[PDB]
Amino acid sequence: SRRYDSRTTIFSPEGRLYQVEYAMEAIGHAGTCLGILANDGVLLAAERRNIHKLLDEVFFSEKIYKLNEDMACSVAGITSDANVLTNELRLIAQRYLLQYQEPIPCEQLVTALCDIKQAYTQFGGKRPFGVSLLYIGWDKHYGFQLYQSDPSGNYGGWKATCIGNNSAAAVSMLKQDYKEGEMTLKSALALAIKVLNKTMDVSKLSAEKVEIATLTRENGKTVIRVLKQKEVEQLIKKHEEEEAKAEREK
Amino acid sequence: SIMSYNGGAVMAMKGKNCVAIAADRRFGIQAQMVTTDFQKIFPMGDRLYIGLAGLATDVQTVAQRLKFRLNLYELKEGRQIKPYTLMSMVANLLYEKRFGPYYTEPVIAGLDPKTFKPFICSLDLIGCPMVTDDFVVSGTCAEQMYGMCESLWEPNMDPDHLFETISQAMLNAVDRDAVSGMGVIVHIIEKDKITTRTLKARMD
Amino acid sequence: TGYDLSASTFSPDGRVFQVEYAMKAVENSSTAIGIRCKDGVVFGVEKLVLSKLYEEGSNKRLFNVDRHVGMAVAGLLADARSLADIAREEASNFRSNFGYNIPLKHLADRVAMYVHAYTLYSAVRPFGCSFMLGSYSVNDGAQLYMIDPSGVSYGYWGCAIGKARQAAKTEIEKLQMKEMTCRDIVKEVAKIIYIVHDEVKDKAFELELSWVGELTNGRHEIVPKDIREEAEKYAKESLK
Amino acid sequence: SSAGFDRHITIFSPEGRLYQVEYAFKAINQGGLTSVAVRGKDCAVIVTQKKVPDKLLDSSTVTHLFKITENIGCVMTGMTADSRSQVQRARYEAANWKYKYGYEIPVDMLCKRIADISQVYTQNAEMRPLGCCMILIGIDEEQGPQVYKCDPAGYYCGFKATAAGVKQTESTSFLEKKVKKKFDWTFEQTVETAITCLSTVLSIDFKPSEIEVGVVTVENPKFRILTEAEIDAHLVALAE
Amino acid sequence: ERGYSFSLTTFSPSGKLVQIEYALAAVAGGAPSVGIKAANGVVLATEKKQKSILYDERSVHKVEPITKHIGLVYSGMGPDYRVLVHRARKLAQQYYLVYQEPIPTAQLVQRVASVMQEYTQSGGVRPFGVSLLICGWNEGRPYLFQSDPSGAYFAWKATAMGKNYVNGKTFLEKRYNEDLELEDAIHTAILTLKESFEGQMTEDNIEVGICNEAGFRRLTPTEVKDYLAAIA
Amino acid sequence: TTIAGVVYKDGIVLGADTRATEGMVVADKNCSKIHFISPNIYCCGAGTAADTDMTTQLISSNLELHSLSTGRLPRVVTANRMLKQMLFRYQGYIGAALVLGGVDVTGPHLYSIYPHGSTDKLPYVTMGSGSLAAMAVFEDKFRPDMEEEEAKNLVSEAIAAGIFNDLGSGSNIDLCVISKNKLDFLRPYTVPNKKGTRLGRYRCEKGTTAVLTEKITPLE
Amino acid sequence: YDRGVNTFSPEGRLFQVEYAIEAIKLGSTAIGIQTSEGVCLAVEKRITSPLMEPSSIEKIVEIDAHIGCAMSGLIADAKTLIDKARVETQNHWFTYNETMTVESVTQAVSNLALQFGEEDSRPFGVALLFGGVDEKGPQLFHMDPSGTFVQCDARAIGSASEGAQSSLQEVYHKSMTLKEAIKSSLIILKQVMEEKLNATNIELATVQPGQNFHMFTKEELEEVIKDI
Amino acid sequence: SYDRAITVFSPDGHLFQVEYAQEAVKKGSTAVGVRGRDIVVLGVEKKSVAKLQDERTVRKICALDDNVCMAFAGLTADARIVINRARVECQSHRLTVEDPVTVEYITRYIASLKQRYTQSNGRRPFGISALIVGFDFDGTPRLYQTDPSGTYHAWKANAIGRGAKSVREFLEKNYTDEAIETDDLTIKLVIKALLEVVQSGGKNIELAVMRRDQSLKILNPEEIEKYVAEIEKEKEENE
């Protein structure tokens, strides 16, 4: 009965965590997201993995999961593994609100999910949650935030994040087009349009294959704008006119 | 009575195309008042309220418990909740404490989310629903509010006569009552907007 | 290789090698036979002296489970004691619940399910036992059952468990069952056990005989073997 | 195409198979035994032979026909312990049905519960999957007789005239050549076809002492096991 | 049951789940099916070949109702299929206990996908080799949901699963459009099932259930034998 | 509350009265004690309302589950067995005075359930607070194997006499008829009572009440 | 080649417990000596760095007011045993008004020296020297990972126990005195240690019927060392 | 649960997972810490920040009480768990006994948890090594370190992380009493030790101090720049 144990917890003679890295290299495939934390608002970007023509798109929602009133998350990795994680995460935020009757601060939410992941990285040898995922949100203490979960339980507050293996060069592009917080809510969207136009090798960015959702700050509302397709289309047309204007320098 | 520990009265009245719910403001221990700003009518989404009467512990507990389950439902399903669904949820939540019962009498008044159809119902302390067409009441001064609404109600009511009818009903049924008084808050809602008025009740 | 390890695994041709290896474990034991007559069941176990090794009265393989049921075990001994204790417990439950004597079919079926249930998994091993179960009742007659290491439990007139298994039933079948009272069958089993299993590897042996039927009025006990001493006076006359 | 441990436990291979249950489909084959069921107009017939090579062995305790309930009979193949344990599980759920639901269990629902339990033994990888094949027969009101079969893999089904065990590629070939050609179905058309199909597969033409015949009919819905004399009557009744 | 509590489903050095990929291959080796949503109802259609001419077609049922308004078919192994069918049955009645209203199909697929994914991770058990095709008429718009052994799910206008699912899929991409009726849905469904099946397709080789906004309906071999005039 | 049941020559006629009293005050003028169980079996409740409601919804869910698992029509004896086992398992704490009726393959079957778990098969039962008056009317004017309109008139007469006697009875009268094929279910069977039109229009005016603090919240 | 943890040997012993007896060997040395005047005891601290504060490393811990101890090698597993032994002696004085004698202490320890298992995990890796003065006079007691508990008159443990036991058998007899045994121990210490013996290397722990509690602060050790 | 023994002894007398989980500490960030006589100081090197993001979440130095301070190496998640449990434990001690929690108590708690953690059924050992700096009653500066075995072990200066042998060798040839004379000099001594460690550009040099009657002050990286500048000035003054 013990010669069938795969041992997904024990340290290898190399010096790393064997099963953890292989979860990370499971992250690296099938996905590419990012968001732009720049002032009054914050955004998310997402890539259609199943862009086949015979879907319904009747969910009113894709990769995003509006998990509270003021937080959603972009996902990458195994899907229903994350659907279980979204259910538990949402339930944690709602039991917090039950406990205090005040909305949930985004970092103790992130530490709650990260300690859930660490608890299945640490004892027993169970299959680890092979899901990295993003965070957008709002609080009473900092305004607008972004966070990057890892299968290990490690997190980090970023200002423009990275998940997918296709987007490491995107982070290089983010640094080569680094700004100091100027959220005209069109420059950051044009920047993200430029990034996903370059990084995916999908030629000329059909808007059905992408997804952008934002979160703006209203006094009593805190609306989350999972925006429609036409403004994305004219954003792409705006950006390709700006690329033609940019290559008038040659 | 444990029901007569803090007083309380909630009235809901169905109009023509709109619905009006009202309650009293007084909070205190049995003969001693404390404050005049105790909340008994809670918002559960848009154009749909709930009223709670009885012991204030179970009022706030069931309101927070219901808000918990309500937000979990509205996040698992992107749509907003139908009133029959809310009625069944409150019935199930109260019936989970069949032998550990809460001391409350919830009153639900809200509109249809698809049409402009009104809806009223009330429940008992164990989860007995009751849908009617005219009015439901809950609290200590039941018989007063029964007399008022069976005296003053008409079937097809413009919101002005609806407001004045529920106003006169609440004022007179509260003024005969002892332990429940100290102001009236009135929520009069419709398809377009939500109006909240407070009446000049006797502060005695 | 790999498929003889667990008690849960199958073979490329479809059998469990664990059960086979446990079956031929009981093959190394001495010899335990049993036979019924028309008003009783006679047991008998060949026990061997090496030189000293004990006292005439330890570890007797003829157990006694209920008031009218006893065991005639052969094989791994400690497992046979554990199985006798389980059978004792089951007859206790039946006597405590339904208020009358356990039918031998039900006792055998409960024991067979326990043996089969210990064969199903990898946490436990199969038993290394093969034993006999005899009975008598005024409304049921004589019943003789038999439980293998796998858990297949059905009935016989005569049987044999041990090394000499065919050569012990070669002359069981030369008996008859309608025409015999058990008092003949006592010296019959006695003379045949002295006949079989020659002096070759082991030198001294010793006989036990359990004995149930109508003559015991429904009781089960060991014979007064010293009384009538019926083996030896014909057994020394059985060498020619 | 094997990968990992797919030869040992119930996991998925590279070709999409699992090997334990398809080793268990020849776990029936070490029984060395053949079973035939027949369902016609308002009767339903089981036939299965015995194999008793011993003269010391009984005939009563060798019956594979197991009366499950007063309107349900069955027959078993495969290894014996799995069959008997499956029988007690079936009886326990039938009595559970009668306690919860009041009326008599339909033979379809019983096979559904047995199939689901066989899946549970198949579903987890750390419990052994019970290599026995189970045939059910039963009477239903407003439908007449029924014949059902439960597999080790957990797929129950039910059909007109069915056979499983050792030699049933040939038996199902004979029953394709026999029930598709417009035969009417009397009580003796069924009995004649049942004994003669096994008599043409094995080609023995034997005594009335080897086959057991379990019958049920809508004139007496009780399950019924035949006596040797009327078995002899049917046997010389097919002797033209 | 023994306390081992480890899961056999672990990540590859490449980062794959080899048992889930094998389960998907086990689904791909199963019986074909096709299911099409066409503006008013959803049509489900399977391919049910008996092994001999002895077998009866009134005992096993592929199209299986879950509520009075929700159909459910598969492409894989029946012995796992009925288990998770029964689980979905028991699951829908707790929802109807709580809310006293028929459960929506999205909520079914949430809970069934959660159960199946949970079952993929928990200890020492193999994943199900079953790909479902769930549908139902909830709140006017009908739906069509496919799941997979990985616990994921989707939403299709029309799809297929089983043998030569890519060939039937490429026929679906060419055949289907936005707007049809139930009859034209059955027409293209039997066309794409007759694309991949054997030559002799009768009233019993196939098994077809439909859906209405008036409710779920499971058709008979009578109307199936009606439709095999002017076949496909 | 006065419910009744009867078995005519083919099926079952059930009745009800829809006055839900709470103590001494009329709390409802239109309620529904005839509950759904199955397409062929219905049920009536009495005594504690929410206990009957939750119990009958649980048993209706379980029997819908069982019927969809089996693939055929439910049996009444199964409903009876589940109900008596549950109510005995609660030791008579749950008060649920039930009348159970349905048509099986065997035909019409009427059961009354007393809240400890004691059940009886009867051709006609009455349960509730005013059941005694309806049982009087039944024992006066019952004959075996009645026809349909005879049974409907009889049950209407019985519950009507219970309403003109009993104090916790009195509203509009519910009926339900179950056959092998035809299920009917009617909201007002016979409305015995009217109400006098108001004699003074006591209508208030637009502004007759002092208002202290307003709020407006627009919507979409 | 991983076998199950609870396997005997083909020879007969056990694997894991044998590996614990191997695991003792890497530990630091300790010497206790029974004398009729009282029990004396010594140990080596094995100081590694000057950054490493000297007085924090514990080797003699205090079981009771009259029961001493010394540990070896693995420290932390030993600390758990020390804690629980103290708890159980306190349960004995509480429920008995009296002093749990040192043998009963060590029986209470070696009842679960070997309870390592997977249900109801590894064997412990420390050898313990127990001293103290009960009613049977002075006592010196030596146990092991295997639970094989024995009385020793003057036991030496750990990494240099071969030459320590030999050269201890050279000097020992029955009628020794206290301070003679103290210097006779630390001679063996500065023959078996690796650094120069000074004020910070070793520490003593002596308990007497007269000197009632084990009391040993620093710098009497200086007066003892300079008498070499 | 998970009835297995993860950590088995070696054939030659080792624990594979305790000695080997020190490698994860050995392949983590470097961090030093000294005690002066009145002011305590610690800080981490090798933050290895990508120079362009937030930095308030990657803070490797935290506190459990107003009296006690943290540091660690190895992987960060196990440190997060141990710090959460340590906060709970120190506050629960404040629940009972009305003192501020002694540092020796919290180090014994952490090491005890770590050892009963290595002992238990199938729990993976913590691949961290903490530094627990605090100054309890009567102003006594003390600092202890942990180990994956669970051995609290009081030091006067630190040697963990990457290349800790080099750092302790610099502290070896730098054990001057006069280095612990001035508080500023002790801070500069930490800066010079961390300068005798990695690039030490003055970016990943995250340091926080406590003057034992105040709370922790995280320093703004301009004072540290002037500290490095005057250290370079003294290095030029050596010639």
Curated annotation (Swiss-Prot), chain C:
Tell me yes or no: is Acetylation among this UniProt entry's keywords.
Answer: yes
Q: Could you mention a single GO BP entry for this protein?
A: proteasome-mediated ubiquitin-dependent protein catabolic process
SUPFAM superfamilies per the UniProt record, alphabetical: N-terminal nucleophile aminohydrolases (Ntn hydrolases)
**Which sequence positions carry the modification called N6-acetyllysine?**
K52, K201, K225
Give the keywords, sorted.
Answer: Acetylation, Cytoplasm, Host-virus interaction, Nucleus, Phosphoprotein, Proteasome
One function term, GO molecular function aspect: ubiquitin protein ligase binding
Which domain of life does the protein's organism represent? Eukaryota
Functional note: Component of the 20S core proteasome complex involved in the proteolytic degradation of most intracellular proteins. This complex plays numerous essential roles within the cell by associating with different regulatory particles. Associated with two 19S regulatory particles, forms the 26S proteasome and thus participates in the ATP-dependent degradation of ubiquitinated proteins.
Descriptive protein name: Proteasome subunit alpha type-3
Origin species: Homo sapiens
Name of the gene this protein is made from: PSMA3
UniProtKB/Swiss-Prot annotation, chain D:
Establish whether keyword Acetylation is in the entry. Answer: yes
**Which UniProt keywords are given for this protein, alphabetically ordered?**
Acetylation, Cytoplasm, Glycoprotein, Nucleus, Phosphoprotein, Proteasome
Q: Which residues carry this modification: Phosphotyrosine?
A: Y155
Q: Which GO terms describe its cellular component?
A: cilium; cytoplasm; cytosol; extracellular exosome; mitochondrion; myofibril; nuclear matrix; nucleoplasm
**Which residues does the record list as Phosphoserine (modified residue)?**
S13, S59, S60
Superkingdom classification of source: Eukaryota
One GO term (biological process): proteolysis involved in protein catabolic process
Give the family this protein belongs to, as stated in its UniProt record: Belongs to the peptidase T1A family.
Function, in words: Component of the 20S core proteasome complex involved in the proteolytic degradation of most intracellular proteins. This complex plays numerous essential roles within the cell by associating with different regulatory particles. Associated with two 19S regulatory particles, forms the 26S proteasome and thus participates in the ATP-dependent degradation of ubiquitinated proteins.
Q: What is this protein called?
A: Proteasome subunit alpha type-6
Q: Which organism is it from?
A: Homo sapiens (Human)
Taxonomic lineage from the root: Eukaryota, Metazoa, Chordata, Craniata, Vertebrata
From Swiss-Prot, chain F:
Q: Which GO terms describe its cellular component?
A: cilium; cytoplasm; cytosol; extracellular region; ficolin-1-rich granule lumen; nuclear body; nucleoplasm; nucleus
**GO BP terms, alphabetized:** proteasome-mediated ubiquitin-dependent protein catabolic process
> Is the keyword Cytoplasm in the record?
yes
**Sorted UniProt keywords:** Cytoplasm, Host-virus interaction, Hydrolase, Nucleus, Protease, Proteasome, Threonine protease, Zymogen
The domain of life for this entry's organism is Eukaryota
Subcellular location field: Cytoplasm; Nucleus
The protein depicted here goes by the name Proteasome subunit beta type-7
Q: What does this protein do?
A: Component of the 20S core proteasome complex involved in the proteolytic degradation of most intracellular proteins. This complex plays numerous essential roles within the cell by associating with different regulatory particles. Associated with two 19S regulatory particles, forms the 26S proteasome and thus participates in the ATP-dependent degradation of ubiquitinated proteins.
The record's family statement is: Belongs to the peptidase T1B family.
EC number in record: 3.4.25.1
Instruction: Say which residues of the entire protein are included here.
Output: 44 to 263 of 277
The entry's active site is T1
Ribosomal protein: is it a keyword of this entry?
Answer: no
Q: How does it assemble?
A: The 26S proteasome consists of a 20S proteasome core and two 19S regulatory subunits. The 20S proteasome core is a barrel-shaped complex made of 28 subunits that are arranged in four stacked rings. The two outer rings are each formed by seven alpha subunits, and the two inner rings are formed by seven beta subunits. The proteolytic activity is exerted by three beta-subunits PSMB5, PSMB6 and PSMB7.
Any single GO molecular-function term of the entry would be: threonine-type endopeptidase activity
UniProtKB/Swiss-Prot annotation, chain G:
Give GO BP annotations, semicolon-separated: proteasome-mediated ubiquitin-dependent protein catabolic process
Subcellular localization is given as: Cytoplasm; Nucleus
InterPro entries for this protein: Ntn_hydrolases_N (IPR029055), Proteasome_alpha (IPR050115), Proteasome_alpha-type (IPR023332), Proteasome_alpha_type_5 (IPR033812), Proteasome_asu_N (IPR000426), Proteasome_sua/b (IPR001353)
User: For this UniProt entry, what's an example GO CC term?
Assistant: nucleus
Mind telling me what this protein is named? Proteasome subunit alpha type-5
Q: Which gene encodes it?
A: PSMA5
Which family would the database say this protein is a member of?
Belongs to the peptidase T1A family.
Keyword Nucleus annotated: yes
Q: Which organism is it from?
A: Homo sapiens
Residues annotated as carrying Phosphoserine in the record are S9, S49, S56
Function in brief: Component of the 20S core proteasome complex involved in the proteolytic degradation of most intracellular proteins. This complex plays numerous essential roles within the cell by associating with different regulatory particles. Associated with two 19S regulatory particles, forms the 26S proteasome and thus participates in the ATP-dependent degradation of ubiquitinated proteins.
